Design a protein that fits this description.
Layout lengths: L1 E2 L4 E2 L12 E9 L4 E7 L2 E8 L5 H16 L8 E5 L5 E6 L4 E2 H8 L11 H19 L13 E3 L8 E3 L15 H4 L6 H17 L10 H9 L12 H10 L10 H13 L1 H4 L8
The protein binds the ligand COc1cc(N2CCC(N3CCN(C)CC3)CC2)ccc1Nc1ncc(Cl)c(Nc2ccccc2S(=O)(=O)C(C)C)n1.
The ligand COc1cc(N2CCC(N3CCN(C)CC3)CC2)ccc1Nc1ncc(Cl)c(Nc2ccccc2S(=O)(=O)C(C)C)n1 binds next to β3, β4 and β8.
């Protein structure tokens, strides 16, 4: 059913892994349609999205569709799909296991504290953002629009240095993520790649505040009105001007005025080269 990079594909095109080759190990949390587990294949370590046996037809198709989409990507900042197990119940989608967990947790559990005073530096944050901008770039030059670029949808391979960040859910592509959306998206329902640009800008704020909820204190409707009136979040605490400057460029009201990801990428690179930026200390939370 699904078309990408030119090629058209279908369920026949997914790697069916024999169920007997799949061991579940522990649960990791819950995604859209159910608990995700840590698991194995034969020795291969994976995450296992599962579909609850008692679910709707549309549930069946959303689940299959997530597999097709994520299976056609080939980029190192987009989580890999090992295969599926769709011919035994409950259904499985096997994905690259990201030991560092999701980005919003990582940021929160790694905030520098008086004991972990050097858990992270500004340069770790810029690499996480480089990683994701690189993924979003790959999507843009393939005309794919993600629609939900947010910290909760990103993942890290490992906790320590050497960690690579990747876009790890494609569920979108009052439940609406208003706080990540540009005016023309929540008003006119128009999406283009300039809307992932806006979202990325908000992700950048999440990254540099260390996992805070955007527009702290505002409900969905207040954000919608704030944002359409020209309102914009302040710099996260300690955020360097040049990094904030990328945020406010991503949030330009006119889609045509926002940068594309090649340009965002250049500017994260320049930030990364600037001693004034990366010699900046993160807030040690007490
Ligand atoms: C060891 O591997 C993981 C650990 C965690 N966590 C979650 C937070 C938890 N802390 C414990 C302490 N608490 C105080 C706070 C919570 C630490 C470990 C989260 C994710 C992973 N790995 C992983 N890889 C690929 C996918 Cl594909 C996926 N997907 C996945 C895993 C879990 C839930 C949802 C999805 S998802 O695919 O639907 C998407 C939303 C990322 N998760």
């Amino acid at each position: 059913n699904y078309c990408f990079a030119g090629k058209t594909s279908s369920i026949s095109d997914l790697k069916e892994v024999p169920r007997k080759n799949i061991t579940l190990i522990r649960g990791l949390g819950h995604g859209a349609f159910g608990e995700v587990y840590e698991g194995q294949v034969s020795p291969l370590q994976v995450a296992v999205k599962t579909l609850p046996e008692v679910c709707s037809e549309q549930d069946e198709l959303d689940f299959l569709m997530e597999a097709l989409i994520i299976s056609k990507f080939n980029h190192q900042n987009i989580v890999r799909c090992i295969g599926v197990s769709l011919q035994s119940l409950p259904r499985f989608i096997l994905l690259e296991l990201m030991a560092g967990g999701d980005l919003k947790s990582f940021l929160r559990e790694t905030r520098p504290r008086p004991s972990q005073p050097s858990s992270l530096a500004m340069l770790d944050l810029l690499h996480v953002a480089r990683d994701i901008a690189c993924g979003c770039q790959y999507l843009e030059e393939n005309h794919f629009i993600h629609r939900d670029i947010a910290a909760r949808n990103c993942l890290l391979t490992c906790p320590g240095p050497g960690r690579v960040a990747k876009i790890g859910d494609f569920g979108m592509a009052a439940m609406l993520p208003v706080k990540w959306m540009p005016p023309e998206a929540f008003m006119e329902g128009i999406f283009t790649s300039k809307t992932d640009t806006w979202s990325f800008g908000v992700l950048l704020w999440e990254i540099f505040s260390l996992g805070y909820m955007p527009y702290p204190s505002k409900s969905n409707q207040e954000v919608l009105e704030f944002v359409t009136s020209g309102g914009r979040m302040d710099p996260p605490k300690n955020c360097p001007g040049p990094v904030y400057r990328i945020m406010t460029q991503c949030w330009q009201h006119q889609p045509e005025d926002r940068p594309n990801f090649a340009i965002i990428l250049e500017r994260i690179e320049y930030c990364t080269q600037d001693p004034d930026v990366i010699n900046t200390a993160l807030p040690i939370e007490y």
